[PDB]
Amino acid sequence: VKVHFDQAGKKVSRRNARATRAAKIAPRPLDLLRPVVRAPTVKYNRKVRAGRGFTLAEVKAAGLTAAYARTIGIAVDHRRQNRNQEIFDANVQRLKEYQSKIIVFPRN
Amino acid sequence: GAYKYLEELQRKKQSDVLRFLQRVRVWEYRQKNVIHRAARPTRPDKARRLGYKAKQGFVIYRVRVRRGRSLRATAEERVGRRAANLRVLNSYWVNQDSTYKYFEVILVDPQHKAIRRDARYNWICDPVHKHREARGLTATGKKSRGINKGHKFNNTKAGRRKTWKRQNTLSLWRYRK
Amino acid sequence: KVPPTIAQFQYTLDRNTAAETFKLFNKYRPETAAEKKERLTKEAAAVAEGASPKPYAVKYGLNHVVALIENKKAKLVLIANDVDPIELVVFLPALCKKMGVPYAIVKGKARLGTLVNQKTSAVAALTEVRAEDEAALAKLVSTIDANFADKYDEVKKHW
Amino acid sequence: NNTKAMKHALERVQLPWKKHSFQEHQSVTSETNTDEHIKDIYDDTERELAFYKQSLDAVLVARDEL
Amino acid sequence: GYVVCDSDKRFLLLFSFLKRNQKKKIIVFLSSCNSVKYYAELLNYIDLPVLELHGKQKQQKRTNTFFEFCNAERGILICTDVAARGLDIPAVDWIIQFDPPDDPRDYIHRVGRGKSLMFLTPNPLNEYEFPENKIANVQSQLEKLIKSNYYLHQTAKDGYRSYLQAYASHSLKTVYQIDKLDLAKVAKSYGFPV
Amino acid sequence: SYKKGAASNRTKFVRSLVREIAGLSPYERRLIDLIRNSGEKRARKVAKKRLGSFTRAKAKVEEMNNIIAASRRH
Amino acid sequence: MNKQRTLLISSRGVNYRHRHLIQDLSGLLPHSRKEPKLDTLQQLNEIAELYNCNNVLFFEARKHQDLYLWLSKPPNGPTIKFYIQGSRPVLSFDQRFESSPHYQLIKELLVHNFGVPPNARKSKPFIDHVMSFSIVDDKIWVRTY
RNA sequence: CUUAGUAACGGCGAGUGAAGCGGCAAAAGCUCAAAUUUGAAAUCUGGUACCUUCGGUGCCCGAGUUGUAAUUUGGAGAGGG
RNA sequence: GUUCUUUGUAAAGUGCCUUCGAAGAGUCGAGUUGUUUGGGAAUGCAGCUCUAAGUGGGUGGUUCCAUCUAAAGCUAA
């Protein structure tokens, strides 16, 4: 019989983990820019949720390349497909807004 | 190059050419020991597509096993005990008899400096890969553990003891559900 | 009992033709590790202070030869009979007969190794040649096709 | 689902069993047993008994012809 | 009207008829616009001052340079069947068509405005003779040359890949892929037919 | 399956080359004789029993028909 | 005159309850032909061409809980789909089978398919059991005693 | 966490007991084998001599063409322009 | 931050145009004897017999359509 006594302990663990990741990845926002996706099954199709990664198509239409996308902190998925038109539009707008916000520091 | 021709030649196993090679080699391998070292892999196309480079540090042990637990894993386990410094990478079928089966298990020396260098194979040097065959982490071991993806492998995907312990032990929170 | 595609070997090239084959082939040695290294240091000493055409040599990798036959670029192909896995080279006389590239089964694998700066070679081929040895090469092609191919037309049969 | 092609199937598929003996047919057409009169269709009580009688009484039709 | 020749020396005969005839405005007709890249690139590199017209170039680049031939007196252009259609110069005497044309029916109709011969192994006017030992021995020069530059090797290749496609994409029951490929490669001079 | 598995002139060449050089397996050696004597009907029966499914045995007997016809004539 | 053959065939995926039904009925039918495996529909006619079988029973398997049995004839058989939740047999029947062509045609099939020809290959002289066929709530119920 | 004690199985009984979806925690992808470097085995081990020594370099030796390097892994990719 | 050196017709990336373009077999599968499960479409595995294909093959949905690419390997939280 397991008991989760460490609910308070592991929240403090997880928070300090994020604090270290903040200290090491200083200007960057801890997590990658994830897409916006329509959920499967009749029950949940009304819900629109955070997907895994974009696509080569959504990345190419935004105005950047796949390998470069990952270095600027955009999660890229390759097995996901662009069947829906409205989702495609929403993600492209999401990337273009993100590209206006980003400030990529020089390597010198 | 030739590996396409060999790949297709190894398909027709009971055909006249390969049938004759079997009956000669089956006699020859019985003359030698139970567990012994072959200098070169007899089916080199298969050796390659299971991760063998013909450089210093790679060893091809030939192993004999009885007929009628799995025989491929027993073959790997036998060479593991004899050649303890080596690490089992993969094994493959070469020849069989009515009484015995033969496998040409391929090994890597983690201690040899030609493997400690190059990054394509230096992963095997990591102590997490000591006796891969004794834990079923080889190709045939992972096969017998029923570890794939699908509806078929639901009760035995991420450890059959792990999913049992998860399902048959009570879980309670601080503020009870 | 041997199945006809095995023992298409052992019915090898005879004494005099094999000698004449090496009289040609020993002219076309690959430049050895020592010779190649010293040449490049000569190039380093010269070009750093103050043109050459493509040099012909024999081609000797199994993958390289199986490329060259069916490319088609090979003219003569020598094949050793003694090979540890025989199945490595059993298709090769048939490949040459199918693509119409003249081949010869030579006797001794180390005998191929001598002309090529290796221990053993299993297969050796001469893709291209210098102009002086062109007529001699084509004569040897006819010599090999008369001795090897025409005498042993029945080599595809008989166990 | 039309019955024109169904009747065309009765033309080609169906074999004449009346021309041959009951030996070759071996099929008791237990007629006048509608079985919509069976009480308790969801409890499976009279459904067991009425079918068991339908099967066993059919043997006696074939028994004389055997 | 025609000259009977085998596929080996079809190009080799043509180079003879050009060198012997170096004063007259003469036109060759070849099939592929890809191909007359090739036969133009040889002749400027085996040094005959030829001209070149094909679809793979611009319009006024094609036109203004075609304009140079029309006001000329001596030389020679190489063009396609298609790009020269509708634009015959009356100042010409030899129309040699190397290939079976695009439309074989309507081809005779475009003559009558210009002396004609063609080239065919199995396939009004008369033929000509040819003394067979007169063809230029440049095939020794060419085989070295087809191996040395890679640009000339590439353009030999496209001049071969596109030659036979057009040979298959044709009308007639006669001109359909019977011809052996050992010799059409020799018209572009290979050891092996690519 | 956009990359389904196109013909590939080389692969076709290698498969048919090995098909003759290897010879014939004992069941196939029996099978080709069974075609010439007992017909294609009984050949498909033995091939279905020997192999797994009938869908395999169709393409197998069809391959044997191609081998026999091309051997004797050409 | 009655010379027929039965051909029990199955699709990929059959065990416990359904394989109890397949194996025991294959045992109970002396003229049965037990086959390995199938995967799809047009092929089934050519399966009958092999063994000269006058009958066919095809077990199709779809949505993980259900059952879909296909009964048909060799030359030009009109098939009927089903959804159910070695002595010489005696074949009992129903009045409501003869009420419509819908149940009369399937009655004909159940006579010579699920029954027996007298000249079967594994035919035993001694009798043991009966075959109960009857309709209640638009469906059939069969038990062997 | 929930789906859920649901589907499903169990002389339907002692009872056994999931999974996809959804919310979250954490997020990272890639390497081979595959068609030739063929205008040059471009690779590595070891010994030895020095050097700025978890190593570098020269020289010698061996492995290695029965294929070690570079280039490619379907998200394609390569050849050229 | 502070410098010392950066080289070689070197190493890539991007878009367009042109020519090609190979992906794992005693394995998949098939029958059967056991083991595994609460597993109904013997699930998973092993033993034994036979053993494939390349506009292929595996898995699902009512006559097509959707979905991935096995039989090789590495990897933190």
Curated annotation (Swiss-Prot), chain A:
An MF annotation (GO) of this entry: RNA binding
Main location: cytoplasm
DNA repair in keyword set: no
Subcellular location: Cytoplasm
Keywords: Cytoplasm, Phosphoprotein, Ribonucleoprotein, Ribosomal protein
GO biological process: cytoplasmic translation
A GO cellular component entry from the record: cytosolic large ribosomal subunit
Family statement: Belongs to the eukaryotic ribosomal protein eL13 family.
Assembly description: Component of the large ribosomal subunit (LSU). Mature yeast ribosomes consist of a small (40S) and a large (60S) subunit. The 40S small subunit contains 1 molecule of ribosomal RNA (18S rRNA) and 33 different proteins (encoded by 57 genes). The large 60S subunit contains 3 rRNA molecules (25S, 5.8S and 5S rRNA) and 46 different proteins (encoded by 81 genes).
Remaining remarks: Present with 133000 molecules/cell in log phase SD medium.
Its biological purpose: Component of the ribosome, a large ribonucleoprotein complex responsible for the synthesis of proteins in the cell. The small ribosomal subunit (SSU) binds messenger RNAs (mRNAs) and translates the encoded message by selecting cognate aminoacyl-transfer RNA (tRNA) molecules. The large subunit (LSU) contains the ribosomal catalytic site termed the peptidyl transferase center (PTC), which catalyzes the formation of peptide bonds, thereby polymerizing the amino acids delivered by tRNAs into a polypeptide chain.
Name of this chain's protein: Large ribosomal subunit protein eL13A
UniProt gene name: RPL13A
Shown stretch of the complete protein: 22 to 129 of 199
UniProtKB/Swiss-Prot annotation, chain C:
Gene Ontology CC: cytosol; cytosolic large ribosomal subunit
GTP-binding among keywords: no
Compartment(s): Cytoplasm
Source superkingdom: Eukaryota
GO molecular function, one term: RNA binding
Gene Ontology biological process terms from the UniProt entry: cytoplasmic translation; maturation of LSU-rRNA
Keywords linked to the UniProt accession: Cytoplasm, Ribonucleoprotein, Ribosomal protein
Family, per entry: Belongs to the eukaryotic ribosomal protein eL8 family.
Function per UniProt: Component of the ribosome, a large ribonucleoprotein complex responsible for the synthesis of proteins in the cell. The small ribosomal subunit (SSU) binds messenger RNAs (mRNAs) and translates the encoded message by selecting cognate aminoacyl-transfer RNA (tRNA) molecules. The large subunit (LSU) contains the ribosomal catalytic site termed the peptidyl transferase center (PTC), which catalyzes the formation of peptide bonds, thereby polymerizing the amino acids delivered by tRNAs into a polypeptide chain.
Anything else known: Present with 238000 molecules/cell in log phase SD medium. There are 2 genes for eL8 in yeast.
Subunit (UniProt): Component of the large ribosomal subunit (LSU). Mature yeast ribosomes consist of a small (40S) and a large (60S) subunit. The 40S small subunit contains 1 molecule of ribosomal RNA (18S rRNA) and 33 different proteins (encoded by 57 genes). The large 60S subunit contains 3 rRNA molecules (25S, 5.8S and 5S rRNA) and 46 different proteins (encoded by 81 genes).
Record protein name field: Large ribosomal subunit protein eL8A
Gene it is expressed from: RPL8A
UniProtKB/Swiss-Prot annotation, chain D:
Residues of the signal peptide: none
PTM field: Sumoylated.
Compartment(s) of residence: Nucleus, Nucleolus
Coiled coil: 39-66
Family: Belongs to the EBP2 family.
Subunit architecture: Interacts with LOC1, NOP12, SIZ2, ULS1 and WSS1.
Function: Required for the processing of the 27S pre-rRNA. Probably involved in the step of the processing of the 27 SA precursor into the 27 SB intermediate.
Entry protein name: rRNA-processing protein EBP2
Organism: Saccharomyces cerevisiae (strain ATCC 204508 / S288c) (Baker's yeast)
Lineage: Eukaryota, Fungi, Dikarya, Ascomycota, Saccharomycotina
Entire-sequence positions represented here: 196 to 261 of 427
Curated annotation (Swiss-Prot), chain G:
Portion held of the full protein: 28 to 191 of 291
Subcellular location: Nucleus, Nucleolus
Biological classification of the source: Eukaryota, Fungi, Dikarya, Ascomycota, Saccharomycotina
Family: Belongs to the BRX1 family.
Further comment found in the protein's record: Present with 13200 molecules/cell in log phase SD medium.
Record's function text: Required for biogenesis of the 60S ribosomal subunit.
Residue ranges occupied by any Brix domain in the UniProt entry: 4-145
Entry superkingdom: Eukaryota
Protein name: Ribosome biogenesis protein BRX1
Cystine pairs: none
Organism per entry: Saccharomyces cerevisiae (strain ATCC 204508 / S288c)
Subunit-level organization: Part of a complex that includes BRX1, RPF1, RPF2 and SSF1 or SSF2.
